[PDB]
Amino acid sequence: PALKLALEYIVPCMNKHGICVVDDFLGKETGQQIGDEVRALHDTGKFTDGQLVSQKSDSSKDIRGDKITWIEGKEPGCETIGLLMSSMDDLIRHCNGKLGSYKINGRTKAMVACYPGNGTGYVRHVDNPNGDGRCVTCIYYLNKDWDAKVSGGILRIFPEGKAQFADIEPKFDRLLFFWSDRRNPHEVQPAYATRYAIIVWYFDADERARAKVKYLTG
């Protein structure tokens, strides 16, 4: 039930901690369907090297070792990813005007991401450091049988002002929210097995408008 989950758990969690974990979000059947769809995308060569906002002399693989593709939710064979995305959107809509001072009106497409084992990860970073509009990061994990003590892949967040950092294992059917800005620097520790996630970034209307203005004027 979106209303209660959003207003009585996600909103207070986000406003107090900037991080919110919802375990067993969709159930095993839907999570497994999503996993099959993601593995189909992988198996048919859809993934490409993850990119960075600003590219410079260094290789992107020195920064993030994952391969990704962008999904709208209506593509053939991505119907359950679409259901995931719609459920995400429903929760966010039910939090309207209650997540900080943001006014969330839109989001990116879904980034389906794979770290292909071999110790790939993502160096310490901030998702939105310079105000490109992203205010909330939403991640769904679908790694059945993952044992993070052996296979790694832990998301470590350093929430600002906290006495402890937050370790999030990429558990099957886990949903995660956190502020995208500098309050939550984070890293994806090296993965030694194939690690899948689906990420959407939700936009604050005003910040996103300013970012687009900066882009469209050079």
Binding site: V53, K56, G106, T108, M111, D132
Partner: peptide, 19 residues
Amino acid sequence: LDLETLAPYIPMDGEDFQL
């Protein structure tokens, strides 16, 4: 450091999903 050199890419152009 320019943290944008470490931030995950999103399309700035083309267009976004409206909720």
